[PDB]
Design a protein around this nucleic acid. Structure first.
Length: 1360
RNA sequence: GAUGAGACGCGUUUUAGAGCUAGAAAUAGCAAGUUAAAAUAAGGCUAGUCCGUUAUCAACUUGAAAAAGUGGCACCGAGUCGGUGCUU
DNA sequence: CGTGATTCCAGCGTCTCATCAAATACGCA
DNA sequence: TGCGTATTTATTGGAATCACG
């Protein structure tokens, strides 16, 4: 019971735990079993694993929330449009909007005429005959000057507002500029007139078809550059073309500018950057930029609308009418040609909705792509369809007006069409003339991203602040929403608070206070020595002020030489001085001060300390906002101190990034006794010159005490809140929370005794043959070799490591100039550049293909320096072709030096011991805080529980070297097994090397890993001395013998004990047997975490009308039998009810008991009042006490070990684990991994001999699977088919049969049934669609660890 | 990458879009086919251009809810955990 | 007439704007 | 040379359908 340890394995879908003792034994304890059964106690081994679904992200929820908000706002836009038209529409037709709102209802449910637009059959038919589409009506309203019906005008405006296009372009977009040729020629002429010394020729360049083609952006750019003579990708006119296409070039090096100001047109106003540029370059660029703007508009418009704008003022309605006319003509031609040539297929094409024909393209679910793919061979087979096929090649055959590619239409086109309609119709309807502005605002209004939801303090996503409390509308939005405050909260609601003080916002990165603090902190520790003086001394306040004034303020960058010369000789009159504490140049620089001096040109204003806070606000404004107008609005407060030109210059400048410390730290806190802030202490601290870290960690000052006292707010908050603040995927956070709860429960298990040690290992989350072939080809081409031409090779064939190295090594040995043969791969060997006794490097950087074994020349160290000198030129040739990396080249060439130094072994042990990931560090912090809570009275932490972080590499090497193989397809026990091994390794490490604690164990322990660890070239005595081991390997003490290089083996003592304390750490004669017995234990606490299902109500797909009760109504008044609806609801949790239901026409009461599925939609109604919900469902006289809530994955034990996990009200899942013997697992791993098994060739031969001599294990495993299936699975057909398939392929090789058996293990796996394959036979899944059996089984409530159980006998809870 | 916020195109259903000719009707033949309104998780109250799909979740005793509490040891073994003895 | 046994199937693309953080690869005092 | 910094980042119910004897 005393001195136990806990090992854990954290994963995205599993958390394995194992409690071990000092002797590496897993205890077994009697746990009391609660409930109403005859069982009172059970025996449980303290090892197991918790299984749960992956933690989903909120991305889908966020997208659905945005979709809901957008739908609500679109409906509100339609409501506003109806509000504008309410009185006039009521004058014309009072029920028009009512018919529009009830158009969805069937004729029976309609309270008005079934025709929405006109209310009568004749007028509706006339409208649809005159206007086949809405675009015909839109074009008619745009062009015709006759008075139009109000209903048609409203319909056009509603279509425009409801579908208004994107807002990716700022400013107006005139649709007339559609002729690409004329505008391109004009831009070419302007460019030639600008740079007359560097003209270009545009003759024979039809840019319209080049840029308007349905091709890639970069492809079209390259084609246009190639077409233009003397034009390149980076050419200035090419830069203008890229700007039109969507790039952001500049004109710095183009013989004009001295800085790198950039201008872009697709974003922002663009009317201020252009003016600023023209202020420098005059009016020369005005015509060129006008032509560039025209071409940029034309490039978009030509692809958006091909129709010329001279004919009509609505180029989008005209384009859609052209689409309709082409569709009609092509449809008639296709009908005629098909009826003429292929009449038989005509019946299918135009009537079979199930096929991807025209009927399936229009009335069916087939899309444009599917329709084209189906009808292209038919068109090619026929004759006279050449034009139709040409149209199909351009994806312009039988097109619809509402297609998937209408997302490139900007809102400017719809706005222009709406404006044209309002201009035409304002003369007849005065209210249209009055509300034209309101309608345009409705169409063009878009909530700024920095404003967010327009809530009123009842939402957890909103941050908007209101100047006044009133209903927000587009017409008064700027009059209500505080845009500046909204953007300030938008930026600051997600920025990090100060590390020391959590209640204060952090300062901007480029704030003057931050830069001054950094400069003073850096100058605090600077020391200077002169020849005359004896001892180095710090800089005084006056000296630092003079240095800042003369160096940091005069020049942006300050160097050590500049400090020595420009100040000490000019002011201090010191000819020579040696300065320590700064190298090359200072890291801190007053760049913001220089920028402000350049902008405002006011030395006094910047130097004045009174104006400093105003600057702290100005820089905060510049960092906070990026919109020019709101930046000007925020700077209006300080606009009374600077001129309009200075204000504009400040507006144009931008800053990004945030600092790490707040003003409350730098100057917000003052020492009680001295009355000085951190900055004040940095300015003058006597001669000690304490830096920021010393100031915040000084007992003589109240800084640390005040920081801690203000840090108690939020200190030790809820565990869930702390885990949520961590950085990582939500699944990993769920795993961390489950691990912490498992640790707490395990501590509860052991009598409230904290474990001596805790070990953790978080598995890292998250074709290549073609990449390897590409790399080899690039290297060969760069080096100029032609070995690839001599010997053909394939991408996949390079997957073999030996052949991959062979092609990388120029078909030669890496150490010997002799050639190599592909046929003799077995005759060749793979050797590690750094020996296995020095590093566990299994990558290509370490593996090398060598024919011989003694050709290295040096066994202990890196191969002999003579071979290195011989192969240096060839290795350099390989490096120049990028066939190898630089680090492996250095490792190979280290034979030039004396050998592998202690730095290499220190790096190796650092690599092998600790993980660089910070998520494991945060998990260790959480565990240490929750376990080590006692505080020593000496201001120290009582580290009574050690938290160790181990890499998966160590456990994997342990398994692959000591034959503790794992197979993930057998069962989930491997999870727990890994945890156990982790614990063992961790304990076996910390007992073996107590002086490396700070390497792995979480804590502020002393650090020494260079001299005290690595010994001299003394294998026999180096380990015996204070040095741990000459070899850098961490787990070499586990093995009995260690192979040094190739061919020679050294021997270690059979019992490994600590050198200093003398404690026995590893008994190789007993510990291995204990580990084998632990891994062979059949009883492992595998727990599937029961979860109430959350998410969507049902399938989002809306099914058509159907006379079935499985459909879910989309709305309260919409009967699914007439309007369709959703189906396939998701059950959050089942409910076991014991009640009676009326049966027969006599309504006799009969006792019943069954599981009722409570869906996500009905969860709230059931939880509000279960009795009424059950009565509505049909049950009568429900017993509330016997109502049992069963979440998903609820465990039931029926009989003879059969365990079923509840998955729904009408389906179960397999809930048993197959405790396959470890011998079978090892045999399967060896046989399946017949190749690439790694290790010495003798070991590989021994493993192959074992596999060949234990072929009967295949039949034994088949019999085991059959027995387990008959005992638990009870899948007769699947088991019979598996047996037949196994008997059919008994003559297949051992590796294939082993892999097929691994696949066959899917039948008996835990969880939902799944289909698998045995060679070519495909076995499906037997689904247990009956939940009537679990009503008489034994329900099991399992705790998180599963040791604490409660068995409820459901047979007792029966009405009979 | 995670979290947020603004938008866009669709997609899907019901109805409108008269299908016509002949044929007792069934049914044949021919015609048309592009579009539109409504909804897009049921809905809730706080009534907002708000919120409704993330996370949390053995059971029992509590505690509104958070949260808390609720369960001999050792030994031999082992087909999913059993027995042996002590305490209990 | 349940009773298995079989089959099909499941909303989805495109932009903008932040913020943070760890991950990875140098910088540096 | 560790702290510090500059950019980059198919599954499993459900429903229907199909023998089906």
């Amino acid at each position: 019971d005393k001195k136990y340890s806990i090992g854990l394995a954290i994963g995205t879908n599993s958390v394995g735990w194992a409690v071990i003792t000092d002797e590496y034994k897993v205890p077994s304890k009697k746990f009391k079993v609660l409930g109403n059964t005859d069982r009172h106690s059970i025996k449980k081994n303290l090892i197991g694993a918790l299984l749960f679904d992956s933690g989903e992200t909120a991305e889908a929820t966020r997208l659905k929330r945005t979709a809901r908000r957008r739908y609500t706002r679109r409906k509100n836009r339609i409501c506003y449009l109806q509000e504008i038209f309410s009185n006039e529409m009521a004058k014309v037709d009072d029920s028009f909007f009512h018919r529009l709102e009830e158009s969805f209802l069937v004729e029976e449910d309609k309270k008005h005429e079934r025709h929405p637009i006109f209310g009568n059959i004749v007028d509706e038919v006339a409208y649809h005959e005159k206007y086949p589409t809405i675009y015909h009506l839109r074009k008619k309203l745009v062009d015709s000057t006759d008075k139009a019906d109000l209903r048609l005008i409203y319909l056009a405006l509603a279509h425009m507002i409801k579908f208004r296009g994107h807002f990716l372009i700022e400013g107006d977009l005139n649709p007339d500029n559609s002729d690409v040729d004329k505008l391109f020629i004009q831009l070419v002429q302007t460019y030639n007139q600008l740079f007359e010394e560097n003209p270009i020729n545009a003759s024979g360049v039809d840019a319209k078809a080049i840029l308007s083609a349905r091709l890639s952006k970069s492809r079209r750019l390259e084609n246009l550059i190639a077409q233009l003579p003397g034009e390149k990708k980076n050419g200035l006119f090419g830069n203008l073309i890229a700007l039109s296409l969507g790039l952001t070039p500049n004109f710095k090096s183009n013989f004009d500018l001295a800085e790198d100001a950039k201008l872009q047109l697709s974003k922002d106003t663009y009317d201020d950057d252009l003016d600023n540029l023209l202020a420098q370059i005059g009016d020369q660029y005005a015509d060129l930029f006008l032509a560039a703007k025209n071409l940029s508009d034309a490039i978009l418009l030509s692809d958006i609308l091909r129709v010329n704008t001279e004919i009509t003022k609505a180029p989008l309605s005209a384009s859609m009418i052209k689409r309709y006319d082409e569709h009609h003509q092509d449809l008639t031609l296709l009908k005629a040609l098909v009826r003429q040539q292929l009449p038989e297929k005509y019946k299918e094409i135009f009537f079979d909705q199930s096929k991807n024909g025209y009927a399936g393209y229009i009335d069916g679910g087939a899309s444009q792509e599917e329709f084209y793919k189906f009808i292209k061979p038919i068109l090619e087979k026929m004759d006279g369809t050449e034009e139709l096929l040409v149209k199909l090649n351009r994806e312009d055959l039988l097109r619809k007006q509402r297609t998937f590619d209408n997302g490139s239409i900007p809102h400017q086109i719809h706005l222009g069409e709406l404006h044209a309609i309002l201009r035409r119709q304002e003369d007849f309807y005065p209210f249209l003339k009055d509300n034209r502005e309101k309608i345009e605002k409705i169409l063009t209004f878009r909530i700024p991203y920095y404003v967010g939801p327009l809530a009123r303090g009842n939402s957890r996503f909103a941050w908007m602040t209101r100047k006044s409390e009133e209903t927000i509308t587009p017409w008064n939005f700027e009059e209500v929403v505080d845009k500046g405050a909204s953007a300030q909260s938008f930026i600051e609601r997600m920025t990090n608070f100060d590390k020391n003080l959590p209640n204060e916002k952090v300062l901007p990165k480029h704030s003057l206070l931050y830069e001054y603090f950094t400069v003073y902190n850096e100058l605090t520790k600077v020391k200077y020595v002169t020849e005359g003086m004896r001892k180095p001394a710090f800089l005084s306040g006056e000296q630092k002020k003079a240095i800042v004034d003369l160096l940091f303020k005069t020049n942006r960058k300050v160097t050590v030489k500049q400090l020595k010369e420009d100040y000490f000789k000019k002011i201090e009159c010191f000819d020579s001085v040696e300065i320590s504490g700064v190298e090359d140049r200072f890291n801190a620089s007053l760049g913001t001060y220089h920028d402000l001096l350049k902008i405002i040109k006011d030395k006094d204003f910047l130097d004045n300390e009174e104006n400093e806070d105003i600057l702290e606000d100005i820089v905060l404004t510049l960092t906070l906002f990026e919109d020019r107008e709101m930046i000007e609005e925020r700077l209006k407060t300080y606009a009374h101190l600077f001129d309009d030109k200075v204000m504009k210059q400040l507006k144009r400048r931008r800053y990004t990034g945030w600092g790490r410390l707040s003003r409350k730290l730098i100057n917000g806190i003052r020492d009680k006794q001295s009355g000085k802030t951190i900055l004040d202490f940095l300015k003058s601290d006597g001669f000690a010159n304490r830096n920021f870290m010393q100031l915040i960690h000084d007992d003589s000052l109240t800084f640390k005490e005040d920081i801690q006292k203000a840090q108690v707010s939020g200190q030790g908050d809820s565990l869930h809140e702390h885990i949520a603040n961590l950085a990582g995927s939500p699944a990993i956070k769920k795993g961390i929370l489950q691990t912490v709860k498992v640790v707490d429960e395990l501590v509860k298990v052991m009598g409230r005794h904290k474990p001596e040690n805790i070990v953790i290992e978080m598995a890292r989350e998250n074709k290549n043959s073609r990449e390897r072939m590409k790399r080899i080809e690039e290297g060969i081409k760069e080096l100029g070799s032609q070995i690839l031409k001599e010997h053909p090779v394939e991408n996949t064939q390079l997957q073999n490591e030996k052949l991959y190295l062979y092609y990388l090594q120029n078909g030669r040995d890496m150490y010997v100039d002799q050639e190599l043969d592909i046929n003799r791969l077995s005759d060749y060997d793979v050797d590690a550049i750094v020996p296995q006794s020095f590093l566990k490097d299994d990558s290509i950087d370490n593996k090398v293909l060598t024919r011989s074994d003694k050709n290295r020349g040096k066994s202990d160290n890196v191969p002999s320096e003579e071979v290195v000198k011989k192969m240096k030129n060839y290795w350099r040739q390989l490096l120049n072709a990028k066939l190898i990396t630089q680090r492996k080249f250095d490792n190979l060439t280290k034979a030039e030096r004396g050998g592998l130094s202690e730095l290499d072994k220190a790096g190796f042990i650092k690599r092998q011991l600790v993980e660089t990931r910070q998520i494991t560090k945060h998990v260790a912090q959480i565990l240490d805080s929750r376990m080590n809570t006692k505080y020593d009275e000496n201001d120290k932490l009582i580290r009574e529980v050690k938290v160790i972080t181990l890499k998966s590499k160590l456990v994997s090497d342990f398994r692959k070297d000591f034959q503790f193989y794992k197979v993930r397809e057998i069962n989930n026990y491997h999870h727990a097994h890994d945890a156990y091994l982790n614990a063992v390794v961790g304990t076996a490490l910390i007992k073996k090397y107590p002086k490396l604690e700070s390497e792995f164990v979480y804590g502020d322990y002393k650090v020494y890993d260079v001299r005290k660890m690595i010994a001299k070239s003394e294998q026999e005595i180096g380990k015996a001395t204070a040095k741990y081991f000459f070899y850098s390997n961490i787990m070499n003490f586990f093995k009995t013998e260690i192979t040094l290089a190739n061919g020679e083996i050294r021997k270690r003592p059979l019992i490994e004990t600590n050198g200093e304390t003398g404690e026995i750490v590893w008994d190789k004669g007993r510990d291995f047997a204990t580990v084998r017995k632990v891994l062979s234990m059949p009883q492992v606490n595998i727990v599937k975490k029961t979860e109430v299902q959350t998410g969507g109500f049902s399938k989002e797909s809306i099914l058509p009308k159907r006379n079935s009760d499985k459909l879910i109504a989309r709305k309260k008044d919409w009967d699914p039998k007439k309007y369709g609806g959703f189906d396939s609801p998701t059950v959050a949790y089942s409910v076991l009810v014991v009640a009676k239901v009326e049966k027969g026409k006599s309504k006799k009461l009969k006792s019943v008991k069954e599981l009722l599925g409570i869906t996500i939609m009905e969860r709230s109604s059931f939880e509000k009042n279960p009795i009424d919900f059950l009565e509505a469902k049909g049950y009568k006289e429900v017993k509330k006490d016997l109502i049992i809530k069963l979440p998903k994955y609820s465990l039931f034990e029926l009989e003879n070990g059969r365990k079923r996990m509840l998955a729904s009200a009408g389906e179960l899942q397999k809930g048993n684990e197959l405790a396959l013997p470890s011998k079978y697992v090892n045999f399967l791993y060896l046989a399946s991994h017949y190749e690439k098994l790694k290790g010495s060739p003798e070991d590989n031969e021994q493993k192959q001999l074992f596999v060949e001599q234990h072929k009967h294990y295949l039949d034994e495993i088949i019999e085991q699977i059959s027995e387990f299936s008959k005992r638990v699975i009870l899948a007769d057909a699947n088991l019979d088919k598996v047996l037949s398939a196994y008997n059919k392929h008994r003559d297949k090789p051992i590796r294939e049969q082993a892999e097929n058996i691994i696949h066959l293990f899917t039948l008996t796996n835990l969880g939902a049934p799944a289909a698998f394959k045995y060679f070519d036979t495909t076995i499906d899944r037997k689904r247990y669609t009956s939940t009537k059996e679990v009503l008489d089984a034994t329900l099991i409530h399992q705790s998180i660890t599963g040791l604490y159980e409660t068995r409820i006998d459901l047979s007792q809870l029966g009405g009979d």
